[PDB]
Structures are given as structure tokens and as C-alpha cells.
Design a protein around this ligand. Structure first.
Ligand code: HEM
Ligand code: HEM
Ligand code: HEM
Ligand SMILES: [Ca+2]
Ligand SMILES: [Ca+2]
Ligand SMILES: [Ca+2]
Ligand SMILES: [Ca+2]
Ligand SMILES: [Ca+2]
Lengths: 672, 319, 674
């Protein structure tokens, strides 16, 4: 692997310069012991020069993110639908790298901002690197790549003062959304629980665009990529995500790192919907339009292979920061479509890597290198790491015996454009009328959420729009929301002191579609990696005993268990001072600790009880093992997701069902 | 505005390229209305190339920060202690620009992290730009510049997984502090309320280092810079700072912007402690050592002039 | 040598940089006569690479050429220096050397009159050690802060960017005459050292005094001198000018060809060694880079052999990207307080950020050391390493305190010579010990032969005559007059001004060995020297004569070119492309005499011009076969002339002619001022 050759071991040895000269680096060379520093101190200057130049431009979008290595394994020989080599045999394994991200925030912003999320996957295939650069939401805000800077300027912080960080909750974003109604479908997804996933492992990945599978006979079909999570679907609640952004800005990257380190590397089924070229316009919308999904009812998913992430990086900067994805990294057997959003992306990724890398030789960085030989006539450029032997790098030549040879459909397994593709018409800067329905599918999506999920989505909109200062922007927002759903507009308008426009039913309907609801997706298929906080006390040896016994039982089921008390000791992981409900997926209070829930210099007033009360309010399974406690907290003993048992074993049985249910949504109020 | 000559107005007019050709920028040029995008579409490429290259490297430290314009006004003719032109007459005014920051976090990290804070002031004087690149804490962690990357590597996120953001609360930082005891003084400051100021306006600025004031006759004195806040000193409590980091990552920059917009531009008295060259080792420590303060009981402050910030930038990136 | 990084493309299908097989000959279009598509990633990846191929040229020494080689130590030098590469008899260290002119841009001519660079990297088992020297042992200026002043003045005028690669303009001579420190280097540059015959026929000098430091901490002062084993040789100006046009690549081709034929050039790497107490003992300051130590004061000690024997595989990746630094120093060597050296230490580390466009330039193959790297440098654009140590700070316990600090006492660390001190005020003041700008230029002048002195005078006459300003010209005469009244008079005669009155403050009659080219005697070897045989296709016996001469000359390793009207078996070059600048000696076979006394195949009088030019430029010339008078009479070359040969016997012709090639130049063909 190109990376193993470049791993540098500093576990032994004496310090050297970058050219191998042993040196020291702790004291500057001075003209006398209290004298000035000398210009001839090359040890000082090389060290500080490297420090001075450590930083590189963050990505223009998706600046905040985290990566891991893994493997993809094909379930079959897929030659019947694609010539793609990585899909050409049952059990064929291909190394991968995946980076997940938020979209709007700068590189130090919180993982748990409400946002679209990136999910970019590199397959290092035996016929070249193939990237699928996708998001956790299947539709995008805009229908043409030329509008990307407008979208991004509007959502990023206001450019006079750079406020607010990593948030759509400001006038410019809502001004854009309300003036560019293509945005509505992605907006409704971002305002749902999909905007605040529980982890990168509990979200899906989508290629968004229609692409083509192309066979070696040259025929093609239209496809959508869907990576379906084997961990299940799960979200935070908004108040929780807010608190998390402050308590642990690294929450998602830590979650991923820890799951990999514990041998619970996340998995997805790599799937496609496949449809014929004659169906580009058969489903009531245009498959070139990236603001539309194909309902699963019209085209089911076919599982192609397993994606598993199972190894963390060695150096974050060298691997995760430096990985440069491109939808232009395509392989034989795949082709593009005329989605005007996809078309323009192809230009952007090659160009922007010049900015990040500062030089044209970025594909030479180890994380970007392919796993097969490179034969071409690209030469020179800053940072050139190759020594090319061929001294006649031009085609056609005789002086290097006509090598490298051209590859195409016929020879050398060349990439080739799907030969069925044509173009006809005027050269136009015109939008297809087939793109004009901006509201039906957002309504489809809304109808497909459960009542409480719909309320959460209304409440996300009430939160953000209430923070918009312009009354005119707020009215314009209501105008667009009303075209999707009168009821949504009414309910949002109620929180901001405006009236909703009259019902305009042109795009209303009652259709639903499967697979888009989180709440509706049923219990998690695994509870491995889920976090249990056990609130205990050092004041009572019974408390510490109950906690220890609960621990060993939950840990066997792959739960990550934290025992919390006033101070650290044997058996106690975390103090109350550093503990928060956002740190847990379930919270248990041990009987012996009853007294804390009723002041201390060791933690803020009311901290133990607030952890339990926040956990309850946020819908998490909560319990007492061994109540004064349920009464102090105002928690009803008969509530779903509330557990009260003396028997450690019965408690564990019940509580583990609650972790799989994940959220108890009957704790959230609904509109009248 | 001091930078009026460079301002660009787009309150009227038709969209143009960077070379003044009127254009559009809403739809790509395509071969047919459902066709592929054309390479010849220069409108698309110039717009997207600019976007693609918008970002520059964040500062190696003090990446998260906010700035404002203002004015410095001298209280006297300071010829008696310095040749400095900006200090040479009572009421003499010099434009300033100040940037405040946290120290460890990247761009986008929260204002209310527990940290040392940057307080950097430019005086655009009639004899050249003079910068005082300061912090809100009067002493620094280390005694030799060569150790800066060691300090910064230890405090910044662990380099395998880049965790944790904007925080000393991890092994590597406390490893460094415990192995490198010069860090103790600044560490105690950072662990006090000075590590979580209520706002940029409620903190002081320090040059940290001993500098020299030099007269036109060549004689010199040793000085420390102290920017004393006219708004008072105030801190958050830690639990509050944590919640704020989530509810409003922009808290300090918003507080500054707002104060300036409402006509409550913050002020500091720019002060120095001034001592003789002969007192370099007289106080029980070496004045060359940036881990030490001169107790005010040994050398009192002299007020040199007033620093007032009263104008927000027009474009954050540009300024 | 750099085998690990080589990429072979002698077979295989075209791929992208990410290994996808592609084509690259036709753009993707919307229809056969349609517009090109943005989705054509094949087109964009290839053109983007091409668009970004160029990097900034070096700020000085932009025009140059390099080769790989070996250094072999002649001894264990432990008794004078701790330097690992010098610690055992026969110890070998790989090297890379780059030679250059100094002022010209990339693509300017090799045979410009100029200072030349001579930079050597030793890839030692204790780190890369660079000696970044010139072919002239003294530099123009005494303080690094003045380098941009010097370089701005010498480089083209910045309104129109004229003239290329030349000191022959007003700004340069204005600087020279206002900054008299420049006189010594100026005189060197105006001598044959400014126009070397090849890179192989010039020496290399570190210029600055450095220190050798023993493991016990004691030090001595040294000057580096790389002494050519090929001998010293120059062009004449009027040949150098023609060669600039006929073959801008003359020096790089000479070097490349010598290595390919197994004649890789060699230098003895030498030092002068003197005690610390002698810094001011020789009548000048050893910190002053405008001064040499006369070899009569300190003799050269030979440390080892430098041989260049392998050409690069890719010029850009190796020669263009090599980034030398005097700060690439190793234990056993140290700096001195030479203010020119002192500032250089800053410049090279800084400027590589400009060339590389990022901080990781030491990771380029040509710049990598041959031993492991252990440090806490991280990230930065273009970072190739994947560091395993996740606690890159000192002091640490979490990486067990590694890497460990290296110093005099542990881990073979670099250390500053511990006897070094400083004392005094912090000052921006020149040491009065630097103030004699004229005595050494005169020492140099005195050491050249009469004809050599005339050539130097003539170089100055040529250049100063092109200076437009009458005031600058007068100022130049004022400075020249302080070195030598006779120089000032002789130069003044060409430019129609009066020299000022003699000012003997700095005049003297001393001389020093080793600086004259003419006086360094015949070349120690004639291998690689170029013999052009002028012949004709019109006479089969002329070709027979040419073939016999070739066999006999190639036996002794001369590079032979047979020139005729057209190419054929046995003919290398046509008259149309042939020129006297292409040869170190010229022979006409008497069978071709008729060509010497019109053709569409070459310019009128070309065969004779080759012979006349070669004669006039001092080269050995002759006619082989017995009938010589038709050629010699047409050329106006005297048969009895030194360096003019005429024999019927091929063997006897070659024996005499080879003596002439070693003499190299026949200096009696050049007029002297009375
Ligand atoms: C279907 C809609 C889109 C999706 C799903 C998408 C997905 C992504 C993802 C996942 C990344 C981060 C890759 C990584 O982790 O390093 C990314 C980066 C980027 N995207 Fe896209 N994107 C889309 C639309 C666009 C458009 C229309 C443009 C421009 C015309 C664009 C320009 C960029 C740029 C400049 C970067 C930073 C790339 C880099 O620095 O490597 N995005 N996008
Ligand atoms: C007394 C101790 C120090 C104080 C008070 C200090 C203060 C600052 C401040 C306030 C800034 C940000 C200025 C702005 O807002 O743009 C800054 C940036 C910086 N500092 Fe210092 N600093 C100190 C020590 C050092 C040392 C020892 C080094 C390195 C040897 C250093 C290297 C830097 C670098 C590389 C930047 C980014 C500068 C830029 O990109 O413009 N700092 N520091
Ligand atoms: C003793 C006087 C000097 C000698 C013998 C000398 C020698 C050289 C040589 C041989 C090179 C080209 C190395 C190569 O082939 O790549 C070079 C490059 C350079 N020199 Fe020096 N030099 C001297 C003085 C200076 C001074 C005083 C400065 C500035 C303070 C300086 C700045 C540079 C710069 C900026 C380059 C381009 C370096 C690069 O891009 O790698 N030179 N010099
Ligand atoms: Ca706004
Ligand atoms: Ca939800
Ligand atoms: Ca750590
Ligand atoms: Ca000029
Ligand atoms: Ca650059």
C-alpha cells in the first residue's frame, strides 16, 4: 500500500533535521547566556519555519469532518449490469477510505450543528480510484452547479462580521431559501432529524445524482447510489444537539474513532436503484433533476456489496485532512448524466485541490495515490515526487516506441462515455421546464414522517425562522412553506406572530413513501457501542457495588458504560463535574446514590439530578436499579422507557430493549 | 472609513466578470435544454474558480478571532521617555485596528473555550505601522521561542484523530505542562476566570515581554505594556461558558460588534510600567523572562493614552 | 541512486494519475463538429497538469546543469574535523553537483561572461552537507544585506528588462564604481574566469572562511577549494559571443557528453587550514569575503576526490528541483562571522518556499537524506510522511521522551564551536578591517600573464564602452585607477576619456600562484576535446583521409566530427550547421582544398570561415596530406606559425596536433597594447 512505505517511526532515536543531521531543538543559540538570538541558528529557523507553514486552506465546504479506512466486498459478479472491475466477482475486495463531515461550518465547528452531512467514499480499485462523493440526504438544494456559490454564501456566516458559525438560522440563508424554491426538498430533510444524526454510523449515504452503469457491450442503465446503514437510523433531538455542540464539539468523530477501536467498525450495504434510459421522465419528474428522489415503490434497491470501516488513520492531517475526492475519479463501467448540478461539480473538485495543496501534484500524496501503475505524460509541477524514465512524453511518438498506448472502449479497458448518449438543440442558458415542480416532493417527504417527527420538523423551522430579523424575509418564507403544506405554514407562523397565507393547493397531495422516516424505521438492529451512564456515589459502598454489577453485565453486550461519581477512584470513570446527559444514550441511577438527587464544591448545584432529568426530557431510556429518585425528577414510574427493578438481570433485559427503541417520543408535546 | 479608497459598491448595476464584461451567473451553457454543460462557458468557470479558491490557511495560532477599527489618542508629549511619533503630543490621534482571539482553536471553534486570548493592536502612525501583539494574560507558558511548536502541538488536538477541539483538557497538554514547569504561571491564569472572559471588552491586553522605550538622545528604559479595560474585568463561570459554546459559538464577536453598533465602543487606557536598565535583575527575577510580571507594588502604571474601538469592518475576510 | 522513485513508461496503457486507463488525443464533443464538454475529465486533468508545469526560477543561478557522483576521502581526517564523511581512508559518499551562470534567466546562454555557481551536496551518513560555492574565490560585497542591490544592478534594467545575462550596462557599472568592494570579483569576472571553457575546466570555491571542529571542541579556520583535474581553460570573448548564439547549451552539453563517454569530470576537494589566531595575521580579515589567502601563506591540503559520473534521469525532478542550503551543515563543520555568509543562512531556507510553493521541499527525492529522519515537524502543504508518533512535542513522557536531544555529548549532535564568543555593542557598522578594496584586485592583476592582462583590459573596454552615462564611466575610471594606473589608462583609451592621475596608495608588485589560466601550463589531459575535420563529398580520397584521421584521433579519446557538404556514412555534420565554436582544433584534409579557394548547401565561404575563425581564436589548426598552401594562403595563416600544422603523415600530423590541443590556446595571435 502506498501509505505503508511512507509511515515514519519516531519511537526511538535522536532528533535530526529534515536532512538527517542530529540536532537539539530546546534552546536558541544566543550571543552570551542573556544575549540576543543568532541568525545562524538553523535549528531554530527550520523548526519554526515548519510550524509557521503547518496550516493549509480548509475545504470550501465540508471543512469539518473525519475519516477512516476499510474494505468493500462485492456480493456478486455484476457484469450483467456494469463493466466495473471492483464489482466483477463474488467476494472481490477493494480497499476504501471514507470521510464524513458537516457541510457549512469551518474546520473547528461542532459536529452536532444542524446541517446536510457529507459522506465521501474512495474505492481504490484495480482499474483506478473511484470516488462516490455523497451526502446523508438524497436531494440537493439547487438544480445547477453555477448557483453553488450563491447557496454557500447565503448559508455561511454574514460576510461583514462572520456571524453565525455553522448555522442556517439567519436572514441570508432564509432569504435564499425563500427566493430559490428548488431548495425546499433539501430544506425539509435538513429540518428533520436527518439534519442532526446521532452519529456518522447511523446515517445513510446518497450519490444524489442519477449516474449510469455501462456494460462492456456499451448499453447503459440509470442508477442512484444508496448506502444503507447496518447500524440503523437515529437522530439527536435539537436541544440535545445544542448542548452537545458545547460539551463535545468532537462528538461524531469520537464516536467513529471509538467504534472502530473497539472492533465495532460501521457497515453499510452499498445499493443502487437501477432503471432504464427510457424512464428518465417516466416517474412524474426528471431523473436529471437532483432535487428529486425515485420513491422505493417505483424502483427497489439492489444490494451490490458490503462497505465496512475498520481502521483509523495514523496521522489525521496526512490522511483525513489531505484526502482529495473527485466525482471525476470515475472508472470503466460508470458514466455521468446530464444533471446540471453534477456536470459542474466535475470542474470544481479538480480546480479546488490546487488551492488546498498549493501545487498540481496532489494525486501523489499517499492517501490519494492509486493501487495500480500510473502511465502517462504529465510532468513537472511544484512538489513532483516521481522520477520519470520516459524522455519522450508526447503522443504520437516513435522515440518511446509509441508508449503509453491509448485506452478506449476497445483496447486496454479504457474508460468510455456511454455510446448511446447524444445531445441535440440550441446552445442555451435555459432551465428545463421539467425541473419546475419544487414543492410536491417536499410534501411527499413531510407526509412520510410520523406525527411527532412532523412536530420536530415544524419546531426546527419555528426555532430558525424566529431568529430571522427581517419581517419581509419571514413572510417570503411562509409563502414557500405554504406551497408545500398549508398546515406547516400555519404552525410555523403561530410561533413568529404572522398569519399564514391562504391555502394554495396546486402541489398538495397525501402520498407517502417508505424509507425516509427515522422514528418510523423501528428499533435499532444493534445496541453495540451505545453509551450507558450509571450515576452512583462514593458515599455508599452499596452504590459502587450496584454500579460494578450493572457494568459487567452491560459491557458484555457491547455497551460502553461510564460510572459517574463525585470523585474518581477504582470503578468510577467520570466525575459529576465533567458528566452531562449528552454523553449517554441511557442513564441509570443506582439505589445507594438516592441522596444526591435531593450541594458540593466538586460539581455544580443540582448536577446529578439534571443529568437524569435532561436524559428523560430528551427521550432516552432511564432507570433506577435497586422511588425518591423518580419523584425528585418528576419522572412517572409507569412511563415507557422508564425502568424500576431490584433484580440487576431483569433491569438489564428491559433497559436493553429501551436502548434499541432509542427514543421515547411520547414525551414531546404536539400542536393542537 | 479609513479604507474607503478600496471599497466596492454593488448596491446598483448589472453583474459583470472581474474584467467588466456584463454577464449572467444563474444558468450553465448547455448543448440543448437537457444537455451537458459546455467547456466554453467562461461565466461558469470564472465564478466557480473564484469560489473554489476562496479559503486561505487559518493562522497557526489565534485562528478564531474578531476585529474592529478605532482611534488612539495620546494623553501627553512623551518625548521624555520615547522618540515615538504617535506619542509626541497631547491629543495626537492615530487610527488603530485591533483583533481579539482565542488561542488554541481552529476557525469556527467556540469563542467561550477556556484559553489564553490574543489582543493584537495596530497603530497606523505617521512614522509607520506599529503593532503590539499581545494576550489577555501578562505572562507566557515558555521561556524560549524554539519551544513554541512543542507547546502548541501539546495543547492542539491529538494528531491521530484531531480530538479535542479548542481545549487543554487532554493528556498531551498536561504532559507538557508537568514536564515543562515554566508553564505553571500562565497555566494558573488560564485556569482562573481570565481563561473565560465575559467579553473582549472586559479583558485587559498585555505586551507580555519587556520592551525598551528609546529617546531621541539614545537613552533607554525598560517597559511592559498594559491595556487596562475601561469596561471593568469580568468572567463567565465554567458551566455557563460550556453551554454558551453550544448556544452561541459567536458570543464574543457578537458582543463586540453589537457594542460598537450601539455607540458603546470599548475603551482601554494604554499604560506602561517603566523601569531603568539597571533594574533588569533587581526585582527578584529577570526582566528578560516572559513567565514573570513586575508586581504593581514595585512599578506603578503610567497612562499613555486612550484606545477606543468604534467602527466595525465592512468585509470580515478582507480586513 | 534515486531508483526507488523512478517511474517506467516503456510499456502499458495510458492512465490518469489515479490509475484509470484513458485516452488523451481527442476531446469529448457534443457531436462530431460540436463544442467540447465540461465533463471531459481526460482533457482537464492533462491540461491542468500542463498549465501548472512551471515553477519560479532560482532568484540567482537560474541557468545551470547537474550530475550525480561520488566523493571518496583520501584519509581519516578525525584529527582536524569530526565530520563523518571525512572519517576514514576511502570512505565514499554520494554527491549531486549543480553548476550555473549567475545573472541570466533560464534559457539564457551558458557562455555569458559571468560568475559561475558550483554547488555540491554530500549525502553523508550524518546528514546532507552542502557546499554552495562559485568558480571565483571572492565575492562582490561584504554584507548579505547588500545582495539585492548587487543583483538588481547586474540584472536587466527593470523598465524594459534589457540586457539579458550581462554586466555590460549602466546600472551594473554604476554599482561597481560606487561600491568599491566589488573590484576583486570584478577583475576575476573580466578575466578568462568569467568565460570558462567548460564546467569541468573551472575550480569551485566556498568563498567564506568556515570552521573545522574536532570532537574535543577545538577548531581551525578553513577555505574550500575544489581543484579541477581536467585543468583550467577559458574561451576568448569573441568565441563566447558566437557560441551564445550557435549553442546556448554548450556547457550543459559538454558535461552531459563527458559523463556519457566515461569521462566523468574529477576535482580534488581541498582546504586551506589556518589557526583561529591567524584571522587578522595575513594583512586582511579572514571574515572578509572579498579576500583570498595567498597559497604562499597557506598551502592546499587534499581531502578527497569528487567525481561526477551519472547524468540525471529527469532534469526537472533532479536538477531543477535540487535545493541547496549552506545551513545544511554537519557535526565537524561550523560557520564564521563573515557578514555575507551570516545572511545567506537565512536566504536559502526562505527562498525554497518560493520555489517549492510549500514547506515540505526536503521530501523531494533529490533533497532527501540517506539516513532516517526523527523530528517533530508536521503537516504543511504537500506532506508525504505519515507520522506514527502522536506526541510530537518535547519534553514528553507519552512518547517515552523520544526523539532524544542530540548535542556535543550525546547522539553525534551538531554543536557550535564552543570557543566562539561575541563582545561589543549591538551595531550596524562595517569593521574598518574590511576597508582595503584595492590591493587584492591588484595582486590578482599582477598574477596574470601579459596576454591575460590584455584580455582583461579588453573585456573592460568592451563593457564600459557600452555604458551611456559619462559620469558613471568617469567614476569607473576612478576606481580602476586605484587598483592600477596602467589599467585605467588602457581602458580610458577605448572610451575617449582621460584617466585620472596615478594614486599609488594601494599599488604594489606582489604576485600569487594558482590564479592565472594562461600560466597554468598545458592541459593534463586532452580526452573529450573536439576536433573538426573539414572534408568534401566531391573527392572519395578526402573522405578516405578523413576516416584515417578519425581512427587515429579517437584512439586517444578525442571527440571527432567530420564535416562535409552533405551527410553520408562517415560524415557527422554538414557545413551548414558547423561552426568553429564547435571545435577545440580544426583540420582540413588536403583532398578538400578546392572548397577553400559557393553552394546552395551552406552559406558563402563557410568552409573557410570555420578555419579562419578557429585560427583567429587561438586554436590549433592544420592541413593533413602534404598539399597545404592553397588552404593556408586563402586563410592567410602562416605555415611557420606556432599551432599551425602541416604534415603528409597522418601519424606525424596527429602527434604534433595533439601537443597543440594540450597547449589549448596560441596566445601569440593576439595584439598587445604597447
Ligand atoms: C449533489 C450535490 C453535492 C454533494 C452530495 C456534494 C458532496 C461533497 C462532499 C461529501 C465533500 C467533501 C469531500 C471530503 O470529505 O473531502 C464536498 C467538497 C466540495 N464540494 Fe461538493 N457536493 C455537492 C455539490 C457541489 C457543487 C455543485 C460544487 C461546485 C460547483 C461543489 C464544490 C465542492 C468543493 C469546492 C469542495 C471542497 C473539495 C475539496 O477541497 O476537496 N459541491 N462536496
Ligand atoms: C508572549 C507570547 C506571545 C503572545 C502574547 C503572542 C500573541 C499572538 C497573537 C495575539 C496572534 C494573533 C494576531 C492576530 O490577531 O492576527 C499571534 C499569532 C501568531 N503567533 Fe504569536 N504570540 C506569542 C508567542 C509566539 C511565539 C513564541 C511564536 C513562534 C515562535 C508565535 C508565532 C505566531 C504565529 C506563527 C501566528 C500566526 C500569525 C499570523 O498568521 O499572522 N507566537 N500570536
Ligand atoms: C559567497 C557568495 C555566494 C556564493 C558563492 C553563492 C552561491 C550560490 C549558488 C552556487 C546558487 C545556486 C545553487 C544551485 O545550483 O541550485 C545560489 C543560489 C541562491 N543564492 Fe547564493 N551565493 C552567494 C551569496 C548569496 C547571498 C549573500 C544571498 C542572499 C543573502 C544569496 C541568495 C541566493 C538565493 C535566493 C538563491 C536561489 C537559491 C535557491 O532557489 O535554491 N546568495 N547562490
Ligand atoms: Ca444573515
Ligand atoms: Ca427525529
Ligand atoms: Ca491527548
Ligand atoms: Ca541599465
Ligand atoms: Ca502557492
Amino acid at each position: 500500500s502506498p501509505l505503508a512505505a511512507y509511515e515514519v517511526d519516531d519511537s526511538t532515536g535522536y532528533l535530526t533535521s529534515d536532512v538527517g543531521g542530529p540536532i537539539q531543538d530546546q534552546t536558541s543559540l544566543k550571543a552570551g547566556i542573556r544575549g540576543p538570538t543568532l541568525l545562524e541558528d538553523f535549528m531554530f529557523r527550520q523548526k519554526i519555519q515548519h510550524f509557521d507553514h503547518e496550516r493549509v486552506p480548509e475545504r470550501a465546504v465540508h471543512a469539518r469532518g473525519a475519516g477512516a479506512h476499510g474494505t468493500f466486498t462485492s456480493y456478486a459478479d455484476w457484469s450483467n449490469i456494469t463493466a466495473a472491475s471492483f464489482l466483477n466477482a463474488t467476494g472481490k475486495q477493494t480497499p476504501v477510505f471514507v470521510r464524513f463531515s458537516t457541510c457549512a461550518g469551518s474546520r473547528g465547528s461542532a459536529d452536532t450543528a444542524r446541517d446536510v452531512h457529507g459522506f465521501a467514499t474512495r474505492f481504490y480499485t484495480d482499474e483506478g480510484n473511484f470516488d462516490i462523493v455523497g451526502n446523508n440526504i438524497p436531494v440537493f438544494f439547487i438544480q445547477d452547479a453555477i448557483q453553488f456559490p450563491d447557496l454557500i454564501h447565503s448559508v455561511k456566516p454574514r460576510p461583514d462580521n462572520e456571524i453565525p458559525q455553522a448555522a442556517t438560522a439567519h436572514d441570508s440563508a432564509w432569504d435564499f431559501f425563500s427566493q430559490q424554491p428548488s431548495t425546499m426538498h433539501t430544506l425539509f430533510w435538513a429540518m428533520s432529524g436527518h439534519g442532526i444524526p446521532r452519529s456518522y454510523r447511523h446515517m445513510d449515504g446518497f450519490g444524489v445524482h442519477t449516474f449510469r452503469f455501462v456494460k462492456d457491450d456499451g448499453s447503459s442503465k440509470l442508477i442512484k447510489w444508496h448506502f444503507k446503514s447496518r447500524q440503523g437510523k437515529a437522530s439527536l433531538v435539537w436541544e440535545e444537539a445544542q448542548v452537545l455542540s458545547g460539551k463535545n464539539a468532537d462528538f461524531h468523530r469520537q464516536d467513529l474513532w471509538d467504534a472502530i477501536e473497539s472492533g465495532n467498525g460501521p457497515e453499510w450495504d452499498v445499493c443502487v436503484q437501477i432503471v432504464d434510459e427510457s424512464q428518465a421522465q417516466a416517474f412524474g419528474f426528471d431523473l436529471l433533476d437532483p432535487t428529486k428522489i425515485i420513491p422505493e415503490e417505483y424502483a427497489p434497491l439492489t444490494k451490490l456489496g458490503l462497505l465496512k470501516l475498520d481502521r483509523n488513520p495514523t496521522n489525521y492531517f496526512a490522511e483525513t485532512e489531505q484526502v482529495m475526492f473527485q466525482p471525476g475519479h470515475i472508472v470503466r463501467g460508470i458514466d455521468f448524466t446530464e444533471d446540471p448540478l453534477l456536470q459542474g461539480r466535475l470542474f470544481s473538485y479538480l480546480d479546488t485541490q490546487l488551492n488546498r495543496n498549493g501545487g498540481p501534484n496532489f494525486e501523489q500524496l499517499p492517501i490519494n495515490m492509486p493501487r495500480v501503475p500510473i502511465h502517462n505524460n504529465n510532468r513537472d509541477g511544484a512538489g513532483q515526487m516521481f522520477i520519470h524514465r520516459n524522455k519522450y512524453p508526447y503522443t504520437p511518438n516513435t522515440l518511446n516506441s509509441g508508449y503509453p498506448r491509448q485506452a478506449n472502449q476497445n483496447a486496454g479497458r479504457g474508460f468510455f462515455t456511454a455510446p448511446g448518449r447524444t445531445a441535440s438543440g440550441a446552445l442555451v442558458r435555459e432551465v428545463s421546464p421539467t425541473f419546475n415542480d419544487h414543492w410536491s416532493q417536499p410534501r411527499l417527504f413531510f407526509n412520510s414522517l410520523t406525527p411527532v417527527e412532523q412536530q420536530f420538523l415544524v419546531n426546527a423551522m419555528r426555532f430558525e425562522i424566529s431568529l430571522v430579523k427581517s419581517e419581509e424575509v419571514k413572510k417570503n418564507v411562509l409563502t414557500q412553506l405554504n406551497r408545500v403544506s398549508h398546515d406547516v405554514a400555519v404552525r410555523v407562523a403561530a410561533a413568529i406572530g404572522l398569519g399564514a397565507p391562504d391555502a394554495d393547493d396546486t402541489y398538495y397531495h397525501n402520498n407517502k413513501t417508505a424509507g425516509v422516516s427515522i422514528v418510523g424505521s423501528g428499533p435499532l438492529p444493534t445496541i453495540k457501542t451505545l453509551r450507558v451512564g450509571i450515576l452512583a456515589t462514593t458515599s455508599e459502598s452499596s452504590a459502587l457495588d450496584q454500579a460494578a454489577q450493572l457494568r459487567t453485565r452491560l459491557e458484555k453486550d457491547g455497551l460502553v458504560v461510564t460510572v459517574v461519581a463525585e470523585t474518581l477512584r477504582e470503578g468510577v470513570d467520570q466525575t459529576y463535574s465533567t458528566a452531562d446527559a449528552t454523553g449517554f444514550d441511557g442513564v441509570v441511577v443506582v439505589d445507594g446514590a438516592a441522596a444526591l438527587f435531593a450541594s458540593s464544591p466538586l460539581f455544580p448545584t443540582g448536577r446529578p439530578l439534571q443529568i437524569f432529568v435532561d436524559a428523560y426530557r430528551w427521550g432516552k431510556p432511564v432507570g433506577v436499579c435497586g422511588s425518591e429518585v423518580l419523584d425528585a425528577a418528576d419522572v412517572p414510574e409507569d412511563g415507557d422507557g422508564v425502568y424500576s427493578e431490584e433484580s440487576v438481570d431483569m433491569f438489564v433485559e428491559e433497559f436493553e430493549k429501551g436502548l434499541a427503541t432509542f427514543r421515547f417520543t411520547d414525551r414531546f408535546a404536539l400542536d393542537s | 472609513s479609513p479604507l474607503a479608497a478600496y471599497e466596492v459598491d454593488d448596491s446598483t448595476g448589472y453583474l459583470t466578470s472581474d474584467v467588466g464584461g456584463p454577464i449572467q451567473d444563474q444558468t450553465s451553457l448547455k448543448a440543448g435544454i437537457r444537455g451537458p454543460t459546455l467547456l466554453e462557458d467562461f461565466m461558469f468557470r470564472q465564478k466557480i474558480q473564484h469560489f473554489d479558491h476562496e479559503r486561505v490557511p487559518e493562522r497557526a495560532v489565534h485562528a478564531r478571532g474578531a476585529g474592529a477599527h478605532g482611534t488612539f489618542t495620546s494623553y501627553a508629549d512623551w518625548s521624555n521617555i520615547t522618540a515615538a511619533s504617535f506619542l509626541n503630543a497631547t491629543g495626537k490621534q492615530t487610527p488603530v485596528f485591533v483583533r481579539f482571539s482565542t488561542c488554541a482553536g481552529s476557525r469556527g471553534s467556540a469563542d467561550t473555550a477556556r484559553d489564553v486570548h490574543g489582543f493584537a493592536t495596530r497603530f497606523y502612525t505617521d512614522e509607520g505601522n506599529f503593532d503590539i501583539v499581545g494576550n489577555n494574560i501578562p505572562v507566557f507558558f515558555i521561556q524560549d521561542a524554539i519551544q513554541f511548536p512543542d507547546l502548541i502541538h501539546s495543547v492542539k488536538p491529538r494528531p491521530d484523530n484531531e480530538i479535542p477541539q479548542a481545549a487543554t483538557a487532554h493528556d498531551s497538554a498536561w504532559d507538557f505542562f508537568s514536564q515543562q514547569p515554566s508553564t505553571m504561571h500562565t497555566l494558573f491564569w488560564a485556569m482562573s476566570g481570565h481563561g473565560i472572559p465575559r467579553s473582549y471588552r472586559h479583558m485587559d491586553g498585555f505586551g507580555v515581554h519587556t520592551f525598551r522605550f528609546v529617546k531621541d538622545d539614545g537613552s533607554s528604559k525598560l517597559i511592559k505594556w498594559h491595556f487596562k479595560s475601561r469596561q471593568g474585568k469580568a468572567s463567565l463561570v465554567w458551566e455557563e461558558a460550556q453551554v454558551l459554546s453550544g448556544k452561541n459559538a459567536d458570543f464574543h464577536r457578537q458582543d463586540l460588534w453589537d457594542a460598537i453598533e450601539s455607540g458603546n465602543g470599548p475603551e482601554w487606557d494604554v499604560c506602561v510600567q517603566i523601569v531603568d536598565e539597571s533594574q533588569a535583575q533587581a526585582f527578584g527575577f529577570d526582566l528578560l523572562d516572559p513567565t514573570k510580571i513586575i508586581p504593581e507594588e514595585y512599578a506603578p502604571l503610567t497612562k499613555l493614552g486612550l484606545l477606543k474601538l468604534d467602527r466595525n469592518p465592512t468585509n470580515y475576510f478582507a480586513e
